[PDB]
C-alpha cells in the first residue's frame, strides 16, 4: 500500500459532518456546556468508526485499540475542531450549529483559557496553510502516537502514516530543506494540541464531578477511562 493509497483510505475514513440540532440563538453557560458535551458524545461514536477504517487498526489487540482511543479522543476532537475553524479566523467551529467566539467563551469559567489555546494553534495551522491531506495524516498520527506482537503492528502502522505525511509534503513540490522545516513545524504543533487537550480534560472532568453536564454514557466512559 503506497502512501498515496493510505492517505486516500484516511479520506474515506473521515467521519461525517455532525450537528447538534440546536435552533440558532445566544449562548448561556448551561446551553454551552450542554452543546459541547452533546457534540463530543456524538463525535465519539463516529471517531470509533473512523479508527476502525484505518488499515490495520482492527488488527491490533483489543487492549491497544481501547487504550489508544481512551487516551487521544480529546486531542482528535480538537484537531478536528481546528481544521474546521481554519478558514474562519477568530472563531471555533465546533459544529455548523455551534460556532463560538472568544468573548462567548467568557460565559464559562476556565474555558476562555482553552479557547485561546485552540485559536492560537488554529491560527498557527492557518499561517502554515495546512492542507486537507496533511490534516488527515496528523490526525491519524495523534491516535497512533498516544501510546504512553500487537506492538509491532502498532509501530508498523504509525510508521506507515508517518511515511504518508512525508509523502504529502513531498508532493507540494517545495525544496527538501523546506519539506523538513514544514514536517517539523507541523509535528511541533501536536505538543500544543496535546497541551490544550489536557486542559480540556481537566475542565470537563471538573464539570462532570459537579454534575453540571447531562449524562452521556460514551462520553462519561471516555472521560473516566482516561482520567483513571
Amino acid at each position: 500500500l503506497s502512501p498515496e493509497q493510505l492517505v486516500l483510505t484516511l479520506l474515506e475514513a473521515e467521519p461525517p459532518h455532525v450537528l447538534i440540532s440546536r435552533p440558532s440563538a445566544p449562548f448561556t453557560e448551561a446551553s454551552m456546556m450542554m452543546s459541547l458535551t452533546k457534540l463530543a458524545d456524538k463525535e465519539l461514536v463516529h471517531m470509533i468508526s473512523w479508527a476502525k477504517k484505518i488499515p490495520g487498526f482492527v488488527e491490533l489487540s483489543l487492549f491497544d485499540q481501547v487504550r489508544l482511543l481512551e487516551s487521544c479522543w480529546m486531542e482528535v476532537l480538537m484537531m478536528g475542531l481546528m481544521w474546521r475553524s481554519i478558514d474562519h479566523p477568530g472563531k471555533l467551529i465546533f459544529a455548523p450549529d455551534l460556532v463560538l467566539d472568544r468573548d462567548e467563551g467568557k460565559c464559562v469559567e476556565g474555558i476562555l483559557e482553552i479557547f485561546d489555546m485552540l485559536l492560537a494553534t488554529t491560527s498557527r495551522f492557518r499561517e502554515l496553510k495546512l492542507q486537507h491531506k496533511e490534516y488527515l495524516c496528523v490526525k491519524a498520527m495523534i491516535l497512533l502516537n498516544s501510546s504512553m506482537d500487537s506492538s509491532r503492528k502498532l509501530a508498523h502502522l504509525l510508521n506507515a502514516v508517518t511515511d504518508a505525511l512525508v509523502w504529502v509534503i513531498a508532493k507540494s513540490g517545495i525544496s527538501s530543506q523546506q519539506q523538513s522545516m514544514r514536517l517539523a513545524n507541523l509535528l511541533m504543533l501536536l505538543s500544543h494540541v496535546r497541551h490544550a487537550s489536557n486542559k480540556g480534560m481537566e475542565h470537563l472532568l471538573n464539570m462532570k464531578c459537579k454534575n453540571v453536564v447531562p449524562v452521556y454514557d460514551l462520553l462519561l466512559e471516555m472521560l473516566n477511562a482516561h482520567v483513571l
Binding site: V45, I48, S49, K52, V58, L62, Q65, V66, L69, E70, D217, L218, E221, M222, A225
Partner: peptide, 9 residues
C-alpha cells in the same frame, strides 16, 4: 460502549 462499537459495525 466503546468496546461494543469496536466489535460491531
Amino acid at each position: 460502549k466503546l468496546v461494543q462499537l469496536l466489535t460491531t459495525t
